[PDB]
């Protein structure tokens, strides 16, 4: 139950039920992006 | 470098306890939730869902709990114009083809509509005709002809009119 | 992990009006009616920081409910970048 | 409410809702068929008064509807006992309950299949029958309207012809026949007489 | 730093432009037009061109897929090639910009389906414009002047939006002093400013799911694309779906995402603010004139409006005249004379009053449909937002130079009709409320439908008790029609065959039992003359898009003028209408004289005549007599 | 669907009918109901499911509740010579359930 959520459940997979009352707008995140030094002009590729 | 990066989308949902299963004079407890990639745009507000995800902690000494979404077990919800299968498996299609050829299917559907309700035979037949609906047509000049059948029930109370309407919504695709 | 202790039947009963100041830092027994519950929030108990130069989580530190230990001087690296709390490594306690 | 009624007028017949609030202008789509149940103007409708008086709805609203089912709770002891026994059997009597009843889910999927696969058209010989019956019905209603000073509370207009055509096409779609049949027309007219023109006949 | 890939893309696009000479011809036409405009002074078309992406796909699949998938590396080469072509053509001693039309495959989306997977890809979004920012200038080059040296210094600015590829961030510092410390005086009027406007596009209400919150995207327009839309329009904006900013990745929840604007298309739709302009080919113009040379051209056109509707011939003629409209007179001193024809239909239930209105809504160049009680006097006219205190244009203001189709006119509140008085007659909307004193301009023609008060038009009582409307309001309406559903066996029969023939109508390519699918028909604002199927079964019936073309041509090209023969006919008809009592369905005012003149002018328009003759005045008088007296010859 | 100004978030709160999903709902001053309250009472008593369509939330909450109601006759006193219809302002569809 949503009221029964406990600190012992932190970082553990939890099964629970409820009602969806609000869905925010899609926000784009980064999964792979290419960067550059303003000085070195050194390309790089971070993966998240 | 934005023209070379690759992005994925994130959507924030907020879950609330079922409104009836709450303490009497207490605001229902709601919990902020997050999903991403193909789990985005999978639910609409008001849907009753079951959630599999990681209970987590977010700092704004105290901390704010929230759940990463791993899977959304969306229950059966209201059937809307968009929320419909529109796709029939083969066996279902042949079964419907067999049913359409039955000679008494008109009587079966008359018997199938509100079978607990006694009498009102022609009313049930008219209900069946309403559920089928006529033909929707569009004249070349833009004129549109009615392709729906609207029926009025008018009588003394206790004639099961409300129950018949409830049956009609329970059987119809969208109501 | 830890056993907490319950104390009952405190002979002194003080209503909310007469707390004044002399009752600070002392055990007090009060009566009243509950108005609002703020819910359950997991409170840090066994906090595990880490340093950017370390690359690993530091040894767990107890955090009493006075104020958390915002470390500014790394024990190992002496670096000013130890501000990071890793979730599942820290032990949390219910706070309402 | 009146503000709802004015919108329901267009929705039932033009199958659309027009909105022109300040700043937003659009014509939404409401392609639905409405089934309405209502008590008469009084708690019980008395034929002792003028039978046009027990019909609370105006001529245009009744013109929208494809039929008006005037149902009366008659006072037959045998029929009342029949209803009571039916109710007891249904209400945990377990005297009920193959092949004569289609489940709700199966019937709903059949409804979807019928609506989405086929949409019949009238046969050319059905048109003559429909026109003849429509003209005869209008002339009979004119006979009544000459007989009675009050105009018929339930009107028969071109919308009634549309209703009969739509019922015939509905039956043909039910039978999954791409062409509407004469038997379909006869059944539709039978329903029309049983549904409308008896409410009209009940009124002066 | 010249690059080989850039040069190769440039030469490939130059080959493409050389292959399809139409774009070359258009560029030449733009250049010669601008030169001619400069010649007359001893408007300026923008340096833009529309590319059909389909032709590019046919010509070069690789380059097409490159534009669609990675426009950052492909659009600038194309723009450089086009600029080179323009410079080479302009042998006579500001780069050109590129625009796209055609099919976008899976990139044609709505604001709801703009998932992040479409970023950095040329998308074509369709929706409704909710907010439009003010058109502000943007500083791109700043010319300064050193008072001591006497030399003009300049600097060029840039930002992430104005270029597709990410440039190295150079902070924008305004030069206050010379390199040698001399003071600089900024030279406005020599520095360059570019118009910049941001608009928000929201999911179209027609296609949006009902009962759910809408989704919106922000569009950045620039230079010639600014102020091409009005809030509430339906648009098809195409441009790169760029993402901007560090997006919080740099230490201070996603990335700022917006659609850089390449092209904006005002999409015409049913009951919206945008009109629908039909391209008139020379073939179309010749056909229009030839059909105008016909004798019963008025009858042919009028019968072409609602073939599926039997009868109501006079109502159809009135609607045709209303669509054509009369000329507007603005006297030198300043006074205004109404030049529109209003029509009111009062009749029994199921006499087709609404279907005619819906036809007018679907066929007029600019029409807006409203119902009575649902739309208040705030919905009509205009309203003040109070949010600072901006004006929200209502139904009648949006329908300027158009048609307003009001349904259930009887039901609409008395206060609403009080509001509609001035709009119907003076063709202005005055606010003068809450410190906002403006006079909005709403020159629209109104057509309405109302049931008679007693549910049906009972001829036993006088017209006044059945109509149940103020006399002034009825005076506003140019033509008032009363239609009664009367029982007649011959008429009932004929109606029956007509309706039955309409119901058994087959589309050109549909199966007998196939269900007909509807389409939204979002026409883009900018086959034979007659129709194969006539439901009434010889007078030819014209194809309805051809009727729209005819109406557009007549409204634009021809402006009739009154002539003495007509003046006399209209004067005599007005006099004997006013001085003779026949229990008219409407009272007679000077508005009836104006109506006679306006109908005569509209009829002259229908014949494509620069002058009004006796026949037009006779037609107008007969139509008005049928309207009022209820009788004809 | 109301937002608490201090915390600034939406909450879906059902009526007393929804809260008493599997219990009783005691409605005092039954005659003195608002129009919205009367409509909600009628919906709960007829279909046992309150439906909500505000702020993007389109769902039908469940309310299967037994109603114990107290109401006052018109004029603060029951007139015996009148039927039940004239004694109480509630309309017949409300009472019939
Ligand atoms: N003909 C009937 N057959 C079966 N049950 C009936 C019939 N008429 C009434 N009922 C019963 O009465 C109720 C339906 O009447 P109701 O829906 O209240 O009518 P109304 O539409 O006039 O309000 C249900 O409990 C139903 O089981
Ligand atoms: N003269 C007519 N010719 C063809 N169809 C007609 C005619 N009169 C009525 N109808 C049909 O009857 C229906 C009612 O028309 P509608 O415009 O809704 O009536 P109302 O005048 O009540 O608004 C429509 O389906 C229309 O096609
Ligand atoms: F019955 Be109608 F829409 F005047
Ligand atoms: Mg009922
Ligand atoms: Mg109408
Ligand atoms: Zn360290």
CB F69: neighbour CB atoms within 10 A? 16
Q: How far is CA E535 from each of CA B134, E316, E340, E538, F25, rounded to the nearest angstrom?
A: 21, 16, 31, 13, 63
Q: Distance between the two ends of chain F, CA-based, in angstroms? A: 28
Give the burial class of C82: count Cβ atoms within 10 A of its Cβ; 0-12 exposed, 13-18 middle, 19 or more buried: buried
Contact F85/D at CB under 8 A: yes
Question: CB-based contact (8 Å) between E414 and chain D?
Answer: no
Separation of first and last alpha carbons in chain A = 33
Q: What span, in angstroms and rounded, lies between the C-alpha atoms of A41 and A35?
A: 9
Does A3 contact B54 at a Cβ distance shorter than 8 Å? no
Give dist(CA E184, CA E241) in Å, integer: 40
Q: How is residue A30 written in tokens?
A: 């980064």
CA distance F11 to D8: 32
Q: Which of D152, D183, D195 is nearest to D50 (CA)?
A: D152
Q: Kindly state the DSSP code that residue E288 receives in the 8-state scheme.
A: H
* H or E segment to which residue D7 belongs: helix D2-14
Structure tokens at E336: 């205004």
User: Helices then strands (H, E): number in chain E?
Assistant: 18, 25
Superfamily of domain E2-107: mini-chromosome maintenance (MCM) complex, chain A, domain 1 (3.30.1640.10)
Longest dimension (CA), chain F: 56
Cα(D37) to ligand 1 centroid in Å equals 12
Q: How far is D17 from D31, CA to CA, in rounded Å?
A: 10
Compute the distance between CA of residue D173 and CA of residue D114 in angstroms, rounded to an integer. Answer: 6
Distance (Å, whole) CA E98 – CA D197: 68
Which tokens hold the place of E390?
A: 């901006």
**Cβ–Cβ < 8 Å for E298, E619:** yes
Q: Does residue D176 contact residue B145 with C-beta atoms inside 8 Å?
A: no
- The ligand whose atoms approach the alpha carbon of C77 most closely is 6
D80 alpha carbon – ligand 1 mean position (Å): 12
Phi, psi of F39 (to 5 degrees): -65, -40
Of E264, E15, E240, nearest in space to E132 by CA: E264
The shortest C-alpha distance from E508 to chain A (Å) reads: 43
As a whole number of angstroms, the distance between CA E466 and CA E185 comes to: 77
Question: Do B53 and A21 count as a contact with CB atoms less than 8 A apart?
Answer: no
Other CB atoms within 10 A of residue E542 CB: 22
Distance from CA of B58 to the nearest CA of E (A): 14
B119 is in an annotated binding site: no
A residues 9-28 near F, CB within 8 Å?
19, 21-23
The response to whether E354 counts as a known ligand-binding position is yes
The two tokens of residue D180 are 């509407």
Distance CA E272, CA E266 (A): 11
b/e code B55-90 from CB counts within 10 Å (16+ = b): bbbeeeeebebbbebeebeeeebeeeeeeeeeeeee
Q: Is residue E480 a contact partner of residue E628, using CB atoms and an 8 Å limit? A: yes
Closest in B11, B15, B52 to A19, CB measured: B15
Taking CA atoms, D65 is separated from B154, D57, D156, in Å, by 12, 11, 11
Neighbours of chain F (3+ CB pairs under 8 A): A, B, D, E
DSSP state, C16? Answer: G
* Chain A / chain B CB contacts < 8 angstroms: 126
Q: Whole-angstrom Cα distance, residue C70 to residue F25?
A: 52
Residue B99 and residue B88 in contact, taking contact as beta carbons nearer than 8 Å: no
| Cα gap C19→C32, rounded to integer Å | 13
Is F52 in Cβ contact with B28 (below 8 Å)? no
Q: What are the backbone dihedrals phi and psi of residue E510, each rounded to the nearest 5 degrees, phi first?
A: -90, 150
Interface test with A, best of C44, C94, C95, C96 (most A CBs within 10 A): C94
In chain E, the residue whose alpha carbon lies closest to the alpha carbon of F58 is E211
| Atom from ligand 2 closest to the CA of residue D63 | 22
The resolution in angstroms reads: 3.8
Question: How far is residue E224's CA from residue E423's CA, in Å, rounded to a whole number?
Answer: 34
Residue tagged 């390309």 (tokens): A43
Residue D59: closest CA among D173, D200, D202, D161: D200
Residues D91, B117 contacting (CB under 8 angstroms): no
Query: How far is residue E512 CA from its own chain's centroid?
Result: 37
Alpha-carbon distance of B15 to A23, in angstroms, equals 9
- Which of D63, D121, D134 is opposite residue E496, by nearest beta carbon? D134
**Annotation-wise, does E377 bind a ligand?**
no
Paired with E542 in beta bridges are E530
Decide if E563 contacts E611 (C-beta within 8 A). yes
Measured CA to CA, the distance from residue D90 to residue D84 in angstroms comes to 10
β pairing state of E243-244 and E256-257: antiparallel
For A32, residues 6+ apart whose C-beta sits below 8 A from its C-beta are A45, A46, A47, A48, B5, B6
Chain-chain contact of A22 with F59 (C-beta, under 8 angstroms): no
Dist CA E462 CA E467 (whole Å): 9
Q: How far apart are CA E65 and CA D178, in angstroms?
A: 45
Closest CA to E114 of F2, A41, D91, A28: A28
Report how far ligand 3's centroid is from the alpha carbon of E405 (Å).
15
Q: What CA dihedral angle connects E21, E25, E27 and E29, to 10 degrees?
A: 180
**CA distances, A3 to each of B51, C41, E173 (Å):** 15, 11, 56
Is residue E351 marked as binding? yes
Residue E354 near ligand 3, beta carbon < 6 Å: yes
Overall size of chain D counted in residues = 204
When CB atoms are compared, the residue of F46, F47, F58 closest to B78 is F58
Please give the structure tokens belonging to residue E65.
């897929």
Cβ atoms of A44 and A36 within 8 Å: the answer is yes
Helix (H) or strand (E) holding C47: strand C41-47
Residue with tokens 């046992």: F48
Cα E322 to chain centroid distance, Å, stands at: 18
Distance CA E416, CA D98 (A): 61
Taking contacts as CB-CB distances below 8 angstroms, the residues of chain F near E212 are: 56, 58
Other Cβ atoms less than 10 A from the Cβ of E280: the count is 15
CB of C47 closer than 8 Å to CB of C69? yes
Asked whether D142 lines ligand 1 (CB < 6 A), one says: no
Which of E247, E253, E259 is the best substitution to test chain A (most A C-beta atoms within 10 A)? E247
Choose from E373, E392, E407 for mutation: most chain D CBs within 10 A: E373
Nearest-angstrom CA–CA distance, C82 and C74: 6
Packing angle, helices E590-606 and E614-629, rounded to 10: 130
Query: Which atom of ligand 2 is least distant from the CA of D158?
Result: 12
Per CB-CB distance under 8 Å, the chain A contacts of F57 are 21
Nearest CA-CA partner of B43 in F2, F57, E109: F57
Interchain proximity E169–A38, CB inside 8 Å:
yes
Q: Which residues of F touch D39 (CB under 8 A)?
A: 92-93
Mention every residue, 6+ apart, whose C-beta is less than 8 A from residue C67: B61
Could you say which of A2, A21, A33 has the minimum Cβ distance to residue B45? A21
Residues 12-41 of F with CB under 8 A from D: none
Ligand 3 pocket, E353 CB below 6 A? Answer: yes
Kindly calculate the radius of gyration of chain B based on its CA atoms and give it in whole angstroms: 25
Q: For chain A, how many residues are written?
A: 48
**Smallest CA–CA distance from C96 into chain B, residue:** B62
Asked if residues A14 and B71 have their Cβ atoms less than 8 Å apart, the reply is no
d(C-alpha E537, C-alpha E497), whole Å:
10
Please tell me the residue having the least CA distance from ligand 2 atom 1: E310
Is B112 marked within a binding site? no
Q: Find where tokens 């209803």 sit.
A: D83
Provide residues of B within 8 Å CB-CB of chain A. Answer: 1, 4-19, 29-31, 36, 40-41, 43-57, 65, 67, 70
The answer to whether the beta carbons of residues D8 and D32 sit under 8 Å apart is: no
Map E209-231 to HEC letters: CCCCCCCEEEEEEEHHHCCCCCC
Please work out whether the CB of residue B125 comes within 6 Å of at least one atom of ligand 1: no
CB proximity E211 to F under 8 Å: yes
């Amino acid at each position: 139950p949503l009221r029964d959520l406990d600190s012992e459940h932190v970082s553990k997979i939890v099964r629970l039920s409820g009602i969806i009352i609000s869905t925010s707008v899609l926000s784009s995140r980064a999964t792979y992006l290419s960067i550059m030094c303003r000085n070195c002009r050194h390309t790089t590729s971070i993966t998240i | 470098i934005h023209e070379s990066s690759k992005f994925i989308d994130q959507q924030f949902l907020k879950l609330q306890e079922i409104p009836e299963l709450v303490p009497v004079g207490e605001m229902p407890r709601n919990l902020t939730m997050t999903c991403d990639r193909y789990l985005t745009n999978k639910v609409i507000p008001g849907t009753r869902v079951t959630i599999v995800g990681i209970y987590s902690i977010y700092n704004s000494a105290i901390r704010t709990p929230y759940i990463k979404i791993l899977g959304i077990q969306s229950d059966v919800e209201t059937s809307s114009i968009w929320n419909s299968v529109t796709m029939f498996t083969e066996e279902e299609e042949e079964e419907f083809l067999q049913l359409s050829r039955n000679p008494k299917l008109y009587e079966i559907l008359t018997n199938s509509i509100a079978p607990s309700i006694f009498g009102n035979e022609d009313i049930k037949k008219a209900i069946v005709c309403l559920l089928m609906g006529g033909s929707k047509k569009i004249l070349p000049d833009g004129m549109r002809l009615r392709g729906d059948i609207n029926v009025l029930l008018l009588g003394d109370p206790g004639t099961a009119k409300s129950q018949l309407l409830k049956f009609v919504e329970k059987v119809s695709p969208i109501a | 992990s830890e056993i907490h202790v319950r104390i009952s039947d405190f002979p002194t009963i003080y209503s909310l009006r007469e707390l004044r100041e002399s009752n600070l830092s002392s055990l007090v027994r009060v009566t009243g009616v509950v108005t609002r519950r703020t819910g359950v929030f997991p409170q840090l108990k066994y906090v595990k920081f880490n340093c950017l130069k370390c690359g690993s989580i530091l040894g767990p530190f107890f955090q009493d409910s006075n104020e958390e230990i915002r470390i500014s001087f790394c024990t190992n690296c002496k670096s000013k970048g130890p501000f990071r709390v890793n979730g599942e490594k820290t032990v949390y306690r219910n706070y309402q | 409410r009146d503000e709802d009624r004015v919108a329901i007028h267009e929705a039932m017949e033009q199958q659309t809702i027009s909105i022109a609030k300040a700043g937003i202008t659009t014509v939404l789509n409401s392609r639905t068929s409405v089934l309405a149940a209502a008590n008469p103007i009084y708690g019980r409708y008395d034929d002792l008064k003028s039978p046009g008086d027990n019909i609370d709805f105006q001529t245009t609203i009744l013109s929208r509807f494809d039929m008006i089912f005037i149902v009366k709770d008659d006072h037959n002891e045998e029929r009342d006992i029949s209803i009571a026994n039916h109710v007891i059997n249904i209400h945990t009597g377990n005297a009920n309950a193959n092949g004569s009843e289609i489940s709700i889910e199966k019937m709903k999927r059949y409804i979807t299949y019928c609506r989405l696969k086929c949409a019949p058209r009238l046969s050319p010989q059905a048109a003559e029958k429909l026109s003849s019956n429509f003209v005869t019905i209008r002339k009979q209603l004119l006979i009544n309207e000459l007989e009675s000073t009050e105009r018929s509370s339930i009107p028969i207009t071109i919308r009634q012809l549309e209703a009969i055509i739509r019922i015939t096409e509905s039956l043909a779609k039910l039978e999954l026949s791409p062409i509407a049949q004469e038997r379909h027309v006869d059944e539709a007219i039978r329903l029309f007489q049983a549904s409308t023109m008896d409410a009209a006949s009940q009124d002066p | 730093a010249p690059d080989a890939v850039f040069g190769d893309r440039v030469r490939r696009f130059q080959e493409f432009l050389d292959t399809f000479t139409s774009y070359r011809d258009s560029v030449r036409s733009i250049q010669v037009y601008n030169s001619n405009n400069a010649a007359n002074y001893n408007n300026i078309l923008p340096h833009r061109i529309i590319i059909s992406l389909d032709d590019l796909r046919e010509f070069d699949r690789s380059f097409w897929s490159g534009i669609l998938v990675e426009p950052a590396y492909f659009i600038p080469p194309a723009e450089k090639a086009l600029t080179d072509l323009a410079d080479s053509m302009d042998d006579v001693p500001h780069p050109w910009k590129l625009s796209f039309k055609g099919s976008f495959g899976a990139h044609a989306l709505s604001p709801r389906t703009l998932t992040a997977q479409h970023l950095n890809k040329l998308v074509s979004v369709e929706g409704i414009v909710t907010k439009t920012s003010l058109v502000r200038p943007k500083l791109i080059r700043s010319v300064h002047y050193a008072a001591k040296t006497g030399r003009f210094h300049y600097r060029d600015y840039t930002d992430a939006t104005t270029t597709l590829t990410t440039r190295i961030p150079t902070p924008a510092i305004y030069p206050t002093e010379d390199t040698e410390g001399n003071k600089l005086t900024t030279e406005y009027g020599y520095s360059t400013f570019i118009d910049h406007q941001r608009i928000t596009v929201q999911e179209m209400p027609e296609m949006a799911p009902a009962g759910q919150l809408p989704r919106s995207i922000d569009v950045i327009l620039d230079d010639d694309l600014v102020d091409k839309t009005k809030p509430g329009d339906r648009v098809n904006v195409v441009g790169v779906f760029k993402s901007l900013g560090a997006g919080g990745m740099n230490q201070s929840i996603g990335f700022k995402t917006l659609i850089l604007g390449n092209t904006v298309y005002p999409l015409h739709a049913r009951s919206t603010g945008v009109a629908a302009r039909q391209m008139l080919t020379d073939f179309d113009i010749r056909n229009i004139n030839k059909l105008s040379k016909k004798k019963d051209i008025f009858d042919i056109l009028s019968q072409s409006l609602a073939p599926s509707i039997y009868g109501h011939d006079h109502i159809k003629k009135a609607i045709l005249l209303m669509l054509m409209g009369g000329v507007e007179k603005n006297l030198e001193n300043g006074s205004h004379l109404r030049g529109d024809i209003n029509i009111l239909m009062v009749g029994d239930p199921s006499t087709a009053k609404s279907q005619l209105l819906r036809f007018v809504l679907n066929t007029a160049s600019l029409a807006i449909a409203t119902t009575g009680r649902g739309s208040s006097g705030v919905g009509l006219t205009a309203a003040v937002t109070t949010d600072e205190r901006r004006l929200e244009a209502g139904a009648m203001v949006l329908a300027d130079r158009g048609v307003v189709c009001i349904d259930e006119f009887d039901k609409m509140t008395d206060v609403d009709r009080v509001a509609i008085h001035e709009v119907m007659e003076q063709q202005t909307v005055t606010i003068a409320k809450a410190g906002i004193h403006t006079t909005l301009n709403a020159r629209c023609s109104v057509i309405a439908a109302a049931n008679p008060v007693f549910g049906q038009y009972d001829v036993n009582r006088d017209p006044h008790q059945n109509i149940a409307l103020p006399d002034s309001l009825l005076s506003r309406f140019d033509l008032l029609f009363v239609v009664t559903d009367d029982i007649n066996e011959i008429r009932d029969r004929s109606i029956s065959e007509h309706v039955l023939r309409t119901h058994r109508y087959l589309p050109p390519g549909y199966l007998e039992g196939e269900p007909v699918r509807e389409r939204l028909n979002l026409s883009l604002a900018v086959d034979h003359v007659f129709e194969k199927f006539n439901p009434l079964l010889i007078p030819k019936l014209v194809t309805i898009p051809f009727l729209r073309k005819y109406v557009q041509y007549a409204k634009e090209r021809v402006i009739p003028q009154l002539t003495q023969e007509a003046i006399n006919v209209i004067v005599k008809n007005y006099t004997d209408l006013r001085n003779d009592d026949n229990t008219k369905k409407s009272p007679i005012t000077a508005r009836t004289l104006e109506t006679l003149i306006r109908l005569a002018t509209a009829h002259a328009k229908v014949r494509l005549s620069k002058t009004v003759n006796k026949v037009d005045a006779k037609v107008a008088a007969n139509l008005l007599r049928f309207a009022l007296l209820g009788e004809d010859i | 669907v109301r937002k608490d100004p201090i915390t600034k978030e939406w909450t879906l709160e059902g009526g007393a009918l929804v809260l008493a999903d599997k219990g009783v709902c005691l409605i005092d001053e039954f005659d003195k109901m608002n129009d919205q309250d009367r409509t909600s009472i009628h919906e709960a008593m007829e279909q046992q499911s309150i439906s909500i369509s505000k702020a993007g939330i389109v769902t039908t909450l469940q309310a299967r509740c037994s109603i114990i109601a107290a109401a006052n006759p018109n004029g603060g006193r029951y007139n015996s010579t009148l039927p039940l219809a004239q004694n109480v302002s509630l309309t017949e569809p409300i009472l019939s359930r």
